[PDB]
Design a protein around this ligand. Structure first.
Ligand SMILES: Nc1nc2c(ncn2[C@@H]2O[C@H](COP(=O)(O)OP(=O)(O)CP(=O)(O)O)[C@@H](O)[C@H]2O)c(=O)[nH]1
Ligand code: MET
Ligand SMILES: [Mg+2]
Ligand SMILES: [Zn+2]
Lengths: 134, 77, 470
RNA sequence: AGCGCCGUGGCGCAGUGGAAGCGCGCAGGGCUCAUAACCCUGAUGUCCUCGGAUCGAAACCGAGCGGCGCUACCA
């Protein structure tokens, strides 16, 4: 008897329509200021709250990708040189593909915890447990 | 991982499914350029190529061994 | 201003905590649903079956909350060889006012005997209907022997099907056939994906699944939509487990035994060896009650080769130091549950894959190791687990003499050589030690397409005994 | 979870014990009619955060961080 099957499926669809009326896109366009010799990104903490990441880890990765380690001020990263703005758009999109969005599911709220010595990637919608720290 | 790249010229990062001296023999003829198989003190594989021919070595691994063609990064330099 | 841990501790003490098992309770009265048995040990084993790249550990984790490791770096992502374990407690609301579908609530191992209901508006609590063990089984085309062993251990089935891929996937059909082989009919069909689907795609997939299960052994198998990522509609699965699946006949009359499927060594590195622990054989008890401080011998045990090529079997006697079940050390063991027997067996004997499918008997029994066995085999028509590109799913041929074929006698994974071929019976020569106690359910697989492929079922009828060397 | 390595000048490599290292880069200058080649000069650092013995520590030692690599999921 498949009668008690359709009721649960309709309940699931109603739960979806309740939770997800739109069916993630909460990633703002980066704003980098080029003062001739000084490039300032005052959007690091705003994307920290728009991606649910630890800002220290964001800054450590953004240092580890380039040959630069600027200054943290406050909610903003400071570096002194000639650099573009599209580069960190690509950096953010790749970082979203690798950490901010889980490859398995479309969710942003997922984040980095420490269950050993390394960083373990965990989710918030489900709780998927993989080792994504490199 | 398995990151392959070309730096102004040299190719650093080479999977070794085929022989490196065979790599020299399949590069030297078509490219007509000098190539040196140098063993640096414990980095990846080093193969030289005189004259900037980065797109040409792109064509080359397209011909011989390239199977991913996405992690190979054309450096500015 | 209570810390969350303090509030949880208050709820745990309020919920009665977890009463310790009696040291010596009356067993002629104990039932699998008794309060003392149910609080700290699982009584029914539920296994999950599905196709690759679908997600079974995720559903088990969502149901219970106990994580399934997925170890060995390379296996952290693709497929696991050893089985997955997870303890869940069936808690049902005592209040009639709240709706039946969300009355049930599955909790994890160390929860109290009565937690507070999380639904808003119900001051009631939960009562423990059953403690359930979960045995996650691999569903890849390479790893079958572990899945067959765990399905032999398995008593209740959860089939997982996702919709957006092809409706007739072969792996789930193969696992269902394997379950049908070993006397198991309580199967619950679960839809993995419902959210990303349209309201008619789901109905078409359901029609396809119903069409699929019409001529197989299981007939009245319910189908339930579930989610592995969103973590919804888990209480309905709990209700279906409570309703559809009863307790298989398992009382205290039958003799004690053990079927070890995993071997665990307890050697914490970095700590001085002055304070160590014994080696653990992870085994299922389907028949018998095991108590703390018992003498037990692994029957196939030490396999060795003499200089003449003869295979010597040395049974591994050992004293039980602990019987770890569920979350806490317990005094007595319940049949129908995967328990870790931590004995004085040398830890290197439980290192990686040594006690994977080995029969073990308590002192007071004499199992029989066999070298040559007589088997009754029954075959199927089409090979399951193969996607033929439009031409007649492969027909299984008859067996030939002297072929190494994988004869999974329950948990034992052995490659036997056929010595005799007839319509129903066959003589199997075993280079690896195998043992028989009563009947043992057996699966048969051949090598036709590289990896092992199931053909049919088998039952031992006789055998050539090897007398233990004392 | 431990044990075997690392802590850059854009990078690779070195001695770590009296105080910024060599080279690959970069820029500038010299050579040449000119280019290449060759030759000279630079500016890029808490050589990872915190302490100890020491007139003095980048090192000698640690009370830990960040990443590596072997065991192997280490009830
Ligand atoms: N969209 C979606 N993804 C899911 C669902 N369930 C699981 N997944 C995905 O599956 C991944 C986990 O797969 P996993 O359980 O390891 O697969 P597996 O059980 O090892 C396959 P096999 O049993 O053959 O070994 C997660 O990263 C998750 O994103 C679901 O219901 N919906
Ligand atoms: C033997 S596997 C079952 C769970 C195990 N007893 C813990 O630890
Ligand atoms: Mg697994
Ligand atoms: Zn996720």
């Amino acid at each position: 008897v498949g009668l008690p099957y359709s009721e649960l499926l309709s309940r699931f669809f109603n739960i979806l329509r309740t939770n997800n009326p739109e069916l993630k896109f909460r990633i703002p366009p980066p704003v980098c200021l080029r003062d001739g010799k000084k490039t300032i990104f005052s959007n690091i903490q705003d994307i920290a709250e728009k991606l649910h990441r630890s800002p220290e880890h964001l800054i450590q990765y953004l240092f580890a990708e380039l040959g630069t380690s600027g200054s943290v001020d406050g909610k903003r990263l400071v570096i002194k040189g000639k650099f573009q703005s599209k580069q960190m758009e690509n950096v953010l999109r790749r970082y979203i593909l690798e950490y901010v969005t889980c490859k398995t599911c479309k969710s942003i709220n997922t984040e980095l915890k420490r269950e050993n010595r390394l960083f373990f990637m965990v989710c918030k919608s489900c709780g998927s447990t993989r080792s994504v720290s490199s | 991982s398995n990151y392959i790249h070309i730096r102004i010229t040299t190719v650093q990062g080479v999977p070794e499914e085929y022989d490196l001296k065979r790599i020299l023999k399949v590069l030297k003829k078509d490219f007509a350029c000098n190539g040196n198989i140098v063993k640096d003190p414990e980095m990846g594989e080093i193969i030289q190529l005189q004259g900037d021919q980065r797109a040409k070595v792109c064509e080359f691994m397209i011909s011989q061994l390239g199977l991913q063609k996405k992690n190979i990064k054309i450096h500015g330099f | 201003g209570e810390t969350e841990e303090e509030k949880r501790k208050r709820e745990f003490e309020e919920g009665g905590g977890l009463p310790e098992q009696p040291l010596n309770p009356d067993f002629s009265k104990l039932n699998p649903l008794s309060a003392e048995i149910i609080n700290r040990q699982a009584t029914i084993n539920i296994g999950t079956i599905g196709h690759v790249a679908h997600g079974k550990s995720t559903v088990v984790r969502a149901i219970s909350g106990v994580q399934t490791v997925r170890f060995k770096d390379e296996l952290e992502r693709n497929i696991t060889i050893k089985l997955g374990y997870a303890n869940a407690k069936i808690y049902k609301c005592q209040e009639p006012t709240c709706p039946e579908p969300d009355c049930y609530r599955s909790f994890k191992s160390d929860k109290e005997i009565s937690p507070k209901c999380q639904r808003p508006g119900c001051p009631g609590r939960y009562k423990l209907v059953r403690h359930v063990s979960f045995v996650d089984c691999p569903g890849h085309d390479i790893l079958m022997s572990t899945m067959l062993s765990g399905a032999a251990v398995m008593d209740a089935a959860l089939l997982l099907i996702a919709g957006n891929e092809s409706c007739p996937q072969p792996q789930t059909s193969e696992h269902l056939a394997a379950i049908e082989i070993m006397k198991l009919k309580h199967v619950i069909i679960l839809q993995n994906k419902v959210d990303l689907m349209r309201e008619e795609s789901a109905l078409e997939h359901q029609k396809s699944i119903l069409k699929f299960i019409r001529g197989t052994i299981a007939d009245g198998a319910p189908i339930v939509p579930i989610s592995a990522q969103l973590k919804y509609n888990i209480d309905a699965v709990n209700e279906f487990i409570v309703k559809t699946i009863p307790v298989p006949p398992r009382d205290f009359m039958i003799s004690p035994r053990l079927i070890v499927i995993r071997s665990f060594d307890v050697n914490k590195p970095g700590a001085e060896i002055e304070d160590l622990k014994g080696g653990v054989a992870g085994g299922s008890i389907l028949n018998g009650v095991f108590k703390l401080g018992d003498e037990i011998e692994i029957r196939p045990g030490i396999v060795t080769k003499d200089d003449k090529g003869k295979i010597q079997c040395k049974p591994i006697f050992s004293n039980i130091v602990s019987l770890f079940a569920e979350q806490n050390d317990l005094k007595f063991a319940v049949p129908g549950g995967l328990i870790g027997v931590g004995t004085k067996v040398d830890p290197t004997l439980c290192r990686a894959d040594r006690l994977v499918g080995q029969v073990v008997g308590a002192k007071g029994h004499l199992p029989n190791i066999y070298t040559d066995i007589e088997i009754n085999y029954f075959l199927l028509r089409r090979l399951l687990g193969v996607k033929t590109d439009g031409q007649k799913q492969a027909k299984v041929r008859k067996l030939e003499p002297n072929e190494v074929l994988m004869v999974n006698i329950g948990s034992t994974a052995t490659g036997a050589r056929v010595v005799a071929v007839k319509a129903d019976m066959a003589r199997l020569q075993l280079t690896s030690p195998a043992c028989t106690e009563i009947n043992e359910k057996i699966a048969l697989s051949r090598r036709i397409e590289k990896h092992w492929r199931l053909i049919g079922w088998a039952t031992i009828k006789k055998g050539t005994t090897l007398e233990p060397i004392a």
